[PDB]
Design a binder for these strands. Structure first.
Ligand SMILES: [Mg+2]
Ligand SMILES: [Mg+2]
Lengths: 134, 128
DNA sequence: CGCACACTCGTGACTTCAGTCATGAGT
DNA sequence: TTGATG
DNA sequence: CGCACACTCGTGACTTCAGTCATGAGT
DNA sequence: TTGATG
């Protein structure tokens, strides 16, 4: 019940739910802009060794569920996703500049949670149920 | 309940497991207890929180919480490397069967952990 | 209201060579 | 140009 | 024997200045 | 000095 992946010095199963918003909370991620964003984020992900498990684009925020290796640090992959998507989106959809002219597509904060198949409470119950704790 | 830092909001939990080198069953009695205390101290000194920790004779389970700035290889190095050094100094008797300079198996097992399941998260992510 | 994850100003790294990440501070 | 997603 | 997360040799980083992490390769 | 934890 776990499907572990293996690398040179480790066995792992790592997933994260990353969410960020549009700067000023403007509702600009619609129609073609949202569609182009999805293609851009997929591309950035593939080039940074991340696997996109789920992606949702709302008018003012984006959700990504990602699978990573132990070597992908969170700040590095968030900078790759948010910084390159902002540059690429303003170049691809110059109309974004009519509501965002200060050089930022994104809110400078990100939200990030680790994700597992079972819950933290089930994992604790499992460890505590073992007989040789000593 | 979500933690906050200068540029991020987060909830990062991991289940980390590693074994004794050669799979020797040496983590018992005073050795096991001394290890738990050493791992808790290393965690507190390196900004990690211990949610749960259990020690079996040949392996350790640790469920810990960290910030986005604490990369996995870095906190695994901090916990395994320093605990080995301290353990051999605190319990010289470990050298009886571990005389090669290693307390631990060089590999580690790590899983991200959430309070809700992936299936529930992934289902709430489409519903909006 | 008064912050702060979000707004603004500031520092440096590094890709996207712009606009994020790191980050302190005032509002 | 802000007011809240996880 | 040959495999590798586990065993061993190798390289470099960096703390714990020893013994992990990074890492490829032969068993 | 190894033989399997998630
Ligand atoms: Mg502040
Ligand atoms: Mg091999």
């Amino acid at each position: 019940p776990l499907e572990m992946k293996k690398g040179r010095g480790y066995v792992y199963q790592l997933e994260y739910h990353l969410i960020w918003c549009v700067k000023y909370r403007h509702q600009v991620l619609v129609g073609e802009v949202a569609d182009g964003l999805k293609d851009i984020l997929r591309d950035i992900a593939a080039q940074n060794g991340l696997e996109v498990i789920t992606m949702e684009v709302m008018p003012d925020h984006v959700h990504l569920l990602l699978s990573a290796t132990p070597q992908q640090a969170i700040p590095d992959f968030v900078k790759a996703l948010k910084g390159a998507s902002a540059r690429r989106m303003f170049v691809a959809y110059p109309q974004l500049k009519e509501k965002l002219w200060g050089g930022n597509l994104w809110n400078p904060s990100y939200c990030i949670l680790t994700v597992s198949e079972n819950t933290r409470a089930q994992i604790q119950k499992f460890i505590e149920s073992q007989h040789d704790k000593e």
